[PDB]
Design an enzyme around this catalytic site. Sequence first.
Site, PDB file in Angstrom:
ATOM      1  N   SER A  63       4.553 -12.350  21.673  1.00 14.17           N
ATOM      2  CA  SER A  63       5.337 -11.343  21.359  1.00 14.17           C
ATOM      3  C   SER A  63       6.564 -12.106  20.815  1.00 14.17           C
ATOM      4  O   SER A  63       7.149 -13.041  21.180  1.00 14.17           O
ATOM      5  CB  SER A  63       6.030 -10.819  22.649  1.00 14.17           C
ATOM      6  N   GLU A  64       6.811 -11.682  19.126  1.00 16.27           N
ATOM      7  CA  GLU A  64       7.844 -12.288  18.404  1.00 16.27           C
ATOM      8  C   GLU A  64       9.179 -12.681  19.239  1.00 16.27           C
ATOM      9  O   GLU A  64      10.165 -13.432  18.954  1.00 16.27           O
ATOM     10  CB  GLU A  64       7.956 -12.003  17.045  1.00 16.27           C
ATOM     11  N   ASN A  65       9.433 -11.729  20.283  1.00 16.39           N
ATOM     12  CA  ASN A  65      10.715 -11.751  20.830  1.00 16.39           C
ATOM     13  C   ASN A  65      10.863 -12.878  21.821  1.00 16.39           C
ATOM     14  O   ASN A  65      11.786 -13.184  22.637  1.00 16.39           O
ATOM     15  CB  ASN A  65      11.292 -10.541  21.522  1.00 16.39           C
TER      16      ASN A  65
END
Lengths: 453, 463, 463, 453
Positions: free
Chosen positions: A284-286
Site C-alpha cells: 500500500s503506497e501509504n
Amino acid sequence: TKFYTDAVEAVKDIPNGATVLVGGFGLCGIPENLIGALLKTGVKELTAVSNNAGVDNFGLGLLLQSKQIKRMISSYVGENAEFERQYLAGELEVELTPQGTLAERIRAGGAGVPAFYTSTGYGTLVQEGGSPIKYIAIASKPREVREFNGQHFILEEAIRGDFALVKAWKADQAGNVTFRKSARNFNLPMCKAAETTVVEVEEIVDIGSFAPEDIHIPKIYVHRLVKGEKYEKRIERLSVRVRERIIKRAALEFEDGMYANLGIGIPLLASNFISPNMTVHLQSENGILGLGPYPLQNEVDADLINAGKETVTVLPGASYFSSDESFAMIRGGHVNLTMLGAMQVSKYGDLANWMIVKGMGGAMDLVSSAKTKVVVTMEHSAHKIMEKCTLPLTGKQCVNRIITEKAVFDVDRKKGLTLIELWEGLTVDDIKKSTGCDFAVSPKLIPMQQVTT
Amino acid sequence: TKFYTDAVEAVKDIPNGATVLVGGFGLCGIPENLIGALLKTGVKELTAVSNNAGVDNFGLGLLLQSKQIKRMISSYVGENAEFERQYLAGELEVELTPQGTLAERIRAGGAGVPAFYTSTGYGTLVQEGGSPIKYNKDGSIAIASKPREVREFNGQHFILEEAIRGDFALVKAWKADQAGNVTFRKSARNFNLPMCKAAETTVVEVEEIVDIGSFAPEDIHIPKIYVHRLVKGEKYEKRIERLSVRVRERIIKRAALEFEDGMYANLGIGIPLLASNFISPNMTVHLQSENGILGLGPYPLQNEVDADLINAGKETVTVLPGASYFSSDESFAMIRGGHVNLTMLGAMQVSKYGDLANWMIPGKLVKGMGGAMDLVSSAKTKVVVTMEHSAAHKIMEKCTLPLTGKQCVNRIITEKAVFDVDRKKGLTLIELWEGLTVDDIKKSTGCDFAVSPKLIPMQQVTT
Amino acid sequence: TKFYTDAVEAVKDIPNGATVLVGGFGLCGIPENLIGALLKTGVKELTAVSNNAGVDNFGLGLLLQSKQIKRMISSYVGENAEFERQYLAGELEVELTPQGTLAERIRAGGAGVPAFYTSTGYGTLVQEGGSPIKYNKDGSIAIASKPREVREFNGQHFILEEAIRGDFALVKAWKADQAGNVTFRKSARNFNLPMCKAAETTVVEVEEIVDIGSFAPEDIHIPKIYVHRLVKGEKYEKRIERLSVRVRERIIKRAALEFEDGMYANLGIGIPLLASNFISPNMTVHLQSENGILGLGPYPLQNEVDADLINAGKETVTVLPGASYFSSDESFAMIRGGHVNLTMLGAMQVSKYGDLANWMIPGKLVKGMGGAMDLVSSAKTKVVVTMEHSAAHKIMEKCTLPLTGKQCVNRIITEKAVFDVDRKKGLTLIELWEGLTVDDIKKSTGCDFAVSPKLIPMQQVTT
Amino acid sequence: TKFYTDAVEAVKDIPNGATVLVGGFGLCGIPENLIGALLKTGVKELTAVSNNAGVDNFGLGLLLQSKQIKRMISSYVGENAEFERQYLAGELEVELTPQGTLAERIRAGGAGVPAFYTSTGYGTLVQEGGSPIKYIAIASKPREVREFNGQHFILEEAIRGDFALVKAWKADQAGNVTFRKSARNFNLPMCKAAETTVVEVEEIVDIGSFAPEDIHIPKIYVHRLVKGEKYEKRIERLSVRVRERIIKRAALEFEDGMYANLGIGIPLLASNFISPNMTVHLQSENGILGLGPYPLQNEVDADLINAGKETVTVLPGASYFSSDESFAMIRGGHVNLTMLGAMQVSKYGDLANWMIVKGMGGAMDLVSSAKTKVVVTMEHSAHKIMEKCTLPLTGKQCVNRIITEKAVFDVDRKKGLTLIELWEGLTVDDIKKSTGCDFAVSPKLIPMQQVTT
Ligand SMILES: [Hg+2]
Ligand SMILES: [Hg+2]
Ligand SMILES: [Hg+2]
Ligand SMILES: [Hg+2]
Ligand SMILES: [Hg+2]
Ligand SMILES: [Hg+2]
Ligand SMILES: [Hg+2]
Ligand SMILES: [Hg+2]
Ligand SMILES: [K+]
Ligand SMILES: [K+]
Ligand SMILES: [K+]
Ligand SMILES: [K+]
C-alpha cells in the site's frame, strides 16, 4: 526537544505566508490538535505542503474553510468540496505533485539534497509544465529532462518548510518519537525537513520505553513536542468485511511470492480470488507491506487504511514504513506487479488515468519503473485504446498489459499491441472494430481465461 | 525470500567481475559467513562496494588477501596493510568516496534515483577529479577519478553524484522472521540496511531466525521485499578491532567550552572526543556517531564490551539512556541536512577563509576521507577545528594539502589562540593564551588576521 | 546547386504536412514566384515558418487564402484579415514567436545547435505557456503553447528555445552567380539568409543570374553550399505595402531629448519615430531597424521609393551614408546582445518596477509581439516608454495585460510627467509638466512613487 | 567609433587580469600593432582568448614571451615552443577548446546567448572534464550532457571579453569594417563579444566606399579604430606549387558536386588526384569555401592560408566567411565528407586523433555531425583499430569508413566493422591478424581500388 502543555504556545510564532509541512495520509496520522491551534492563532497565507486536503471539515479542510491557506502542495485532493471550490474559482493555488515525488522532495529537503532525478512524471504535465496552479494566473513550470542509462528522468527540487506539524504516536521524555501503523506516512520525513518541527503525540512515555533500534524519529529532529488534548479518531471510509469478467481475468495476474500494488476498484477486487495456496504480498503506497482483507466492524482502526483511504487489516509478517520509504520501494522497482484502472492507454503503452482535477496520487510513481510489470484493467470502449492518448498522461510507454472484458493485450514500447486472449464469442474482427489502432495477433491466441475461485 | 542452510549455495552464482555491496562499518556488522563463502567459491575481479577494508585478515581483508577484489569503492581504508600494499602497488583499484556520498548513492541505487546533488566533496578532488584510483608502481597516478559536475542551488554549489547499484549485496543482520523480515542490532546496522535495497540479488546472513510475528510491524528494519536470499550464519567470531575500556591539555580544555546544553555534536577522534570528558554533568550534550548512533556514552567497562557498538573511530563504546540507532544513509542525511549543531575535529591545515585540509598527505596518507567531507558540508553546522598551532604553518592563505571542504571551518582552537573564521573577512583572533601577545600569534600564523576589540585570555574549562 | 527554369519543377516534391521556411519581412524579400508555384502544386497542411503573414492577397496570404497552411510560426501577423479570421475561428494554428527568437532558432537549426538560452520572452506567455496556438470558435483556447524551461546564468533568467529546421526553405534573393552563390539586396535580406541554412532542401529564387566571378568572394551573402535549388523568378511585382513619402506633440518633444550624439537607438512605430525628426543636425544618431538595417534615414521622395527598403513598421524609407544591411539573426544578435543603446517604444501599461505590457489585449489584439520582446530583453539597453498618461491607469502596481518583458522599462514619458524606473525601488518622478503638481500626478498614477529632489519642469526640444 | 592615431592610446586602459579576445588564425589576420602596443603598456595576467598561440616570436607569442599572459583559451597551440614550455611547466594556464565551440561561444557572448548546446566534444575530455589547465593545480570542469532528438549534446557557455583586439582590412570614416580573404576567421565574431572592441586596419576609406550590403562588421560593434602603422605580412608556412596506396584509395572518396573538408597530410594529398571532369568544393575551417592548389611563389598571399596554415589559392566562385559561420556550416552537417588522419579508431567508430598536447583544433567539430560522412586514412598498425580507443577521443561513434594500405572498412555504430576492400595479396586472415577486434566481411569484398590519375 522543548515540551509544551498547550498547542497554541507551540505554534504561536508561525508567520503569515510561511511554508508549513502537514503530516497525514487522508485522515490517517493528521495533527488534528496542531491544526486546531492554527485555527486559534489565525495565521494566514500559508503554503501548506500536505499529501491530501483532508475532508471538508477536518484536517487541512478546516484551514481551507477558514481561508488560512494560500497554496497547497499536494498529490491527491479529492473528497473535499470546499477545496475544489476555491481552486476552480481562483481563490486557492494548488501544485499537484506526484505523491512519490512529494515524499522524496521532502526527504531531500531534510537530507541536504537540493535536487535529484526521478522518472516519475516524465512525459506528463509534471515535466512539461502548464497545469494551472491558480486562475489562468499561474501555471506550473516545466521540469528539466536528462537521461541516465538510456532512460529519461526529470529534475525535482527539495521541499523545506518553515514549520512541520507532525502527528506521532508516542514520545519518550527525551523527545524520541514513534508512529503507529499506517499513520506514519509523511509524518516521518516531514519531521526532518523544516526549520521548526512541532510534534503532537497521543502519549508521552519514560525514557527507555523504546528499544534504541526502534526509534522512528530520533529526538534531534523533534524541536517542539506536545501531548495532543483531543483525538477524534475519525474514519473517512468505513469498510467492513462484464466487470466480473475483467475481475476474474485480472485475478490470474497473481503469482505465488509476488509483491503487487493494486489500485482501487477492479484490481483490488481481483485479490479476493487469490487461491489460499498462493502467497501474494500487497503493498500500500501509504506505507504498508502485507495488506489483509477488510476488518470486522470491531477490528476497525483509524490508523490502518489502504491507499483508497478504506479501513483495512494486515496479515502476519506485515511491515509499516514512511511515505518516502514506500515510494523508494516503488520507484526502485521492488514491487513486481502494479495493477490499476485506466481511462486511456496508447498503442505503445502510454497511460492516461488521473485528469479529465483531484491529482495523480501515487499513480505516476507506480508506472515509473521498467522493473515493474504494469497491468491495466478497464472496460473496452468511444475508444479507450488508441494510437495516442487524448487525456493527460500518467506515464509514457509504461503499460505492459491491458485486460478488458473482451480481450487481453500485451503491450510493447516498440512493436505495439499483441492480442493474446480473446473472449469466447468474439472474433479478432470484433476486437479490431472496438480498438483504435492496429495490433498483432498472437499465434497462440487463447480464449480469455477466468480464475476458478 | 528464499532460505538457505548453506552460505555457499546462497552466493554460488555471483559472477566474476560482479559489483558486490558488502555491509559493515569497520568490523561492525560485517557478513563474515558470506565473506567466508566467497573464499570458497573463489569468484574474482570483484568491484567491492564496502565502506571500509576490514582489517588484514578479516572482513573484506580476507578477500583482498585472496586477490578476489579488483576494485573497491570505500570511504575509509586504514588499518589494513595488505590493502595499502596492493593499492600503492597498482595491484588494486580504489575509489575513495565520501562516506555520506557512498551511503546516499547506494540508497539512490535502490530508490530509483539515478543521480542527485550533494555539497559533500565540492571544492576537493572528489568534484575536481584527480583522486587516485590506481597508482603506478611509483610513477604517480595510473587511473585518476573523473570530475563531478557542479551546479548551484539557492546560492550554493553542489556536485552531481550517481546512484550505485550492485549485482549482489552481502548483508549482515541480527534477526530474520520466517517471512524474511529483518532487523539490525545497535550500530551494526550502518550500511547493511541501504545496501539491502540496492542490488539485484540481496543475500542476508543473520544470527537468529524467529517466528513470524516476533517483530512489531512498525519495527521491521528491512521488509522482506528487499530480502531475496536468507541464511543463518554458522559462525560469528564477534571480533573487536579496538578494545577501549574505561599543550594538548590546553586545546582540550578550551575545546571543552564549545559545548552548550542541549547541543547535538559530532566529535572526531582524538582531541575533540577527549574534550567531551569535561562536560559538566549539569549540561546535556547529545553526541552523534556517523556510523549511526545518537547518544554516545563513555567507554565500556571490559564486560560491557559489545562488538555491535563502536564509535566512528572503531572503538568499543556505550550509549546513554534515550539513544537511537539508524542506518548510514540516515546518519548522513542527518549530517548533510545540518541537524547536528557542532562538528568538532582535528585538522592538518586550515585556510584564511576557512578551507580545511585534513584527509590526505601527498603520497604519505591515503586512507580516505571517511565522513569528514560530509561533516563540514553544511552551512547550518558550526565547524570547529582543534589542532596544534604550527609544525611550519598549519594556518595560511591557501591550503597546500588536498581540501576536505572549502570555506567551511568557523573556528580554530590551537594551544595559543582561538580564531573565529569568516568566509569573506578572514580570521579574527578572539582568544589569546596568557603569556603570548598578538605579535607572537602573528609570527606563528601564515596570513593576516583581525583582532577582536574584545580579545580575552584563552578560557579553560574548570572540570 | 541545381538550376531550374521552372519554379514548379523546383518545389514539386514538397510533401503534404511539410515544414516550410518562407523568407521575407512584410512584403520585403518574399519569394513570390515560389509561393506562386506552391499554389499550382496545391501541396497542403503546411507548417509555414514565416516572420509575417504577408497581406490578404500576397505572400503567405495567397497560401492562407488557398487553405494550404495548417500552422504558422510567425512573430507579427497583422494586416491580413483572412489570416485573423482563420485564427480566431480555429481554422488555422499559430505559434506567436518573438522575432529574435524566431531568427535565432532558425540559425540554430542550421548551425547544429539543438537548443540555446535567451532572455527574450522570460516572464511572459512565451516562457509560461498559455499563448494561444489555436482558438475555439469562441470558447477561448483550444491549443495552448507549452512553457519554456527557465534557467539562470550570471544572476539573470533565460529560457530554453529549440532549433527550428524545415523540410524546405523558400528563399528570395537578389543575385546568384552560375555556381549558386547568392546575395541579397538591402533590407530584403531579413530571414532569407538564415532560412537558407536551416532546411534539408533550400530553394532560392533570384532576380538575376550572373557570371561566376561577379561577386568578390568576401561578399557572398549565402555560399553555394547552402543553395540546393536555384531558379530565376519569372515575375516580380515589386509590391509596396505602405507607401510613405516625405498632448501628443508634448510627448514627442520630450522623447526627442532622449537622443545623444553617437547613440545607437531603435525607435518603435509612432511617437518614438516621430521624435527622431527633432534631432539636431549637429547630433549624429544611428537608427537601427530590426528587419536588418543600421542607419535609417528619412522617408523617401516618391521616386526614391524602393520595395527592398522598408523600416520595421513596413514603411518605405531611405538610409544615410555609411549604413549597413544584415540578416534577421544578425539583427537580433545585435539587439539581444545589448549593442543598441536606446530602445524607445509605445506601451499600453508599464508596472511600478518596470514590467511592460505592449503586444496583446485579452481577445482584441492578437497580431503577435514582433521584435518587442527582444528589444527590451537586455539590461545593457536603456528602454524608454512613450505613452499617454491614463485611459484608466496605464502605470500601476502590476500589469493586467500580457507582459512584453519583466522589470525592463527604465523611463516613462507621458504628456504629464517623466519617470525613471528602477527594478527594486520603483518609480521616481523626475520631470513634471508646467501647471501640474505632484498631487495631480499622484491622482493620475496607479501606485506610489518617489519624487526627485531635483524635480524639473518637463523639458521640450527646441527644434 | 572613436579613431586613434596611436595604438598605445587605444589600448592603454586594458586592466591587469582582463580577458582579451585576440583575433587571427595562425598568423593570418592577427592584430600585430595592437599586440605591439600591449608590449609597451606591459599590462599583465591576461586571459587571452585566441584561437592559436601565434608562433614563438610573433602574434600571441610575443605576449607569452613577455610573461603577459596568465591563461589562454585556444583550440590549437602548436608551433610555439615557448608556449609549450610555460604550459608543461606550470607557468601558463590553458583551456584547450574545440575551435568550433570557441567560435560559437564568442558569438553567443555578443548575441545575448549565455549558453547553448553542441555535439562537439561529447564523449571526450571536453565533456568529461579533467584536462590540466595548470600544473595538477587546475583541471577542466565537465560540461553538462543533455539529449535532443535522440542525440547527446553538451552545454557550453558564452565567452565575453573586456576587450577585443581585432585585425581588419578596411574601415570607412564611420567605423564600418571589412576583412580580407581568410584573415577574417575569429576577428569578426570577436568584434561583437567584448565591452570594448579595438580594431586595427590597413586602410581607412571614405564613407560610401562600401556597398551597405557588404559591410562585414557594422560600426556599432567598432568602439575604437586605429590604422596599423606596420604590417610585416608574415607567412608561417610558405607552400609553393604504402602511403601512395592509401592516398590513391582516399582519392576515390570524391564525388562530383561534393563538399569536402580535408585534414592535413594524406587527405589533402588525395585531392591532387581529382579528375578535372569532377567538381569538388573544398571547405577550409578557417573560413573558406573553394580551396584551390598551392600558389606560385608570386601568388603567395599572407591573408590566404588553409587550416594547416599553408599558403593556398581559391578557385573561381569561392567564398570567405567567419569562424563562427564556418563551424556553423560544419556543425550543421552541410559539408558532405570530412576526411582525416587518425591515431586510433574504435570498432564502433570512436576516433582518437588529437592528444597523446597542442589541442584538438577543429577536429572535434568535423566529426560531430551525423549528416557528414567521416572517412579516416591511416597506416594499418601496435593496433590502431581495436575494441576501445586508449588515447583521448575526438568523437564517439563518429567514423564511417577507414582506409589503411591494407584494407577499407565501413564502420557502423551498432554492428561494428565490415571489410569492404582488400589489398591484392592479402587475405582476410592477414587483416584479421593486423586488427584488434572482430569484423564482418562484405559478401561483395573487392580488391582495394586505386584512382587511375
Ligand atoms: Hg548514449
Ligand atoms: Hg473506431
Ligand atoms: Hg562560489
Ligand atoms: Hg612564519
Ligand atoms: Hg528573479
Ligand atoms: Hg485613479
Ligand atoms: Hg526519448
Ligand atoms: Hg594482435
Ligand atoms: K513496466
Ligand atoms: K559551517
Ligand atoms: K533596460
Ligand atoms: K558521420
